[PDB]
Amino acid sequence: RVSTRSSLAEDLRAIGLADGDAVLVAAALRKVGKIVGGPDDILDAMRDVIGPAGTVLGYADWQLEDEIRDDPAMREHIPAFDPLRSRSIRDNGFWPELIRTTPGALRSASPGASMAAIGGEAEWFTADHALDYGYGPRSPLGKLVEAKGKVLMLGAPLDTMTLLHHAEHLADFPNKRILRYEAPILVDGEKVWRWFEEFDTSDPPDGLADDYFAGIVEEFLATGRGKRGKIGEASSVLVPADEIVAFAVDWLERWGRTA
Amino acid sequence: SRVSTRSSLAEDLRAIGLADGDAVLVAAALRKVGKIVGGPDDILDAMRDVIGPAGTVLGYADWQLEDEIRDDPAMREHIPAFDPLRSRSIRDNGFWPELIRTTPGALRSASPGASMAAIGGEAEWFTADHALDYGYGPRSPLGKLVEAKGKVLMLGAPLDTMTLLHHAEHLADFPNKRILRYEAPILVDGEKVWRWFEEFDTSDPPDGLADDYFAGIVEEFLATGRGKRGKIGEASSVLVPADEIVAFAVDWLERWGRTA
């Protein structure tokens, strides 16, 4: 069947979205199916279910492709990171670009961990995003747990749950990989190369698989605290950010104590 | 097999004919340009560097409607009205018009079928007072482009996608000019109100002509030496004065209707 802004609203209410919720969404918009007014009907329906006080987020990142790090003669030609002009990454899909390009949207300043938010608390999730360790508490992810937010996997593969990288920052497990890279950002309004360091989110900890987030999400849904539903034609899940992070921290700490 | 930079694209745009201050309507196929360092925005950034802050880059936006609005009924109330701020550009000619519209500081026309995204110094002038009915006539950024003696750059896109020539279809005097009538939801007094539109049909060539007959008119105009070709990145491009090819397409169409 075709999905409308009214139809998508009922599908989002059924899966467990309410007024005032702040939900981080990673979406594979192709699985949703035919929509009348395009994929904007999804975002418009969400802002109707959660209201103007609710907030919708999306993992923006940016198109850099690691050709900046050690391809000199590119350095003077790589544009600086601008949280107003830098396009979001196309790895997980068009959904982060849909939020950012929507009028009235905002975008945090940490290049690797940048989130595109829109809604009443969009000014709060994007503000004061730490550059180094951009997945820690001083990030939109940590504020999503602090605000008891939700996460909706709109047909996207479950291993793409970026929120669980915030659990990697908190989990006490031995030998985390410290990733030090150099990226160009805007310092005093001009392009300046800053040295960054964070926990390796491009590769899992030594031992686990690249998609070990998928097993953590499937284990959490087995508890019943999560909800599974369909939005249009895309089978989706909806989990609380505060519980699945604490569930993943215990998952990682339990796995790390085997030393 | 070379890569293009913001500085590299600027020097390529200067050789094709782009200069300071002038306006340029761009229909582009960004894949033909090849690898670019800072993404496709380097193309738009390079133009605004060559044309200066007073120049204006325009793009044919239209909007996503897919003609499912046409007569599919009771799907009528579910169609969001046309918003020159939130309705996205059609994706059939490429990402370029949406690249301009989503760029900060850009504006967008008000005629749904013929809407145009513009950014630059005179972005306010080109997008203003765009007539809903006959959105390709003299009261459109196409007519304002001819008035300001702008240019048209075919950045890898096929020459039959030069939208400016639709403005010449409106000006040319040839018999049996088809008329397209349709209704689409727009914004009247801040609310969605359906409106019947009347315009010269642009989705089909007039009187059994080739669907790509725009490409021939540009190819014949380029034979006069009045335009200029040149590679921008790795894409063969065509820069053409806006006023001269409209006068060329008018005489081409008027003499064609006479010969019939």
Numbering used by the authors:
A (entry chain A): 4 to 262
B (entry chain B): 3 to 262
What did the published study say regarding this structure?
Here, we conduct a comprehensive functional analysis of the Antibiotic_NAT family of aminoglycoside acetyltransferases. AG resistance is primarily conferred by three classes of aminoglycoside-modifying enzymes (AMEs): phosphotransferases (APHs), nucleotidylyltransferases (ANTs), and acetyltransferases (AACs). AMEs permanently alter the AG substrate, preventing them from binding to their target, the A-site of the 16S rRNA in the bacterial ribosome. The fold typical of the Antibiotic_NAT family is evident in all structures, composed of 13 α-helices and 8 β-strands, and determined structures superpose with pairwise RMSD’s 0.8–1.0 Å between 197 to 266 matching Cα atoms.
The meta-AAC0038 adopts a dimeric structure with a buried surface of ~900 Å2 per subunit. This enzyme also forms a dimer in solution according to the size exclusion chromatography (not shown). Similar sequence signatures (residues Thr165-Glu171 in meta-AAC0038) were identified in all analyzed members of this family, with His and Glu (His168 and Glu171 in meta-AAC0038) along with two glycine residues (Gly122 and Gly158 in metaAAC0038), completely conserved. This motif’s threonine (Thr165 in meta-AAC0038) is also conserved in all but one of the analyzed sequences where it is substituted by a chemically similar serine.
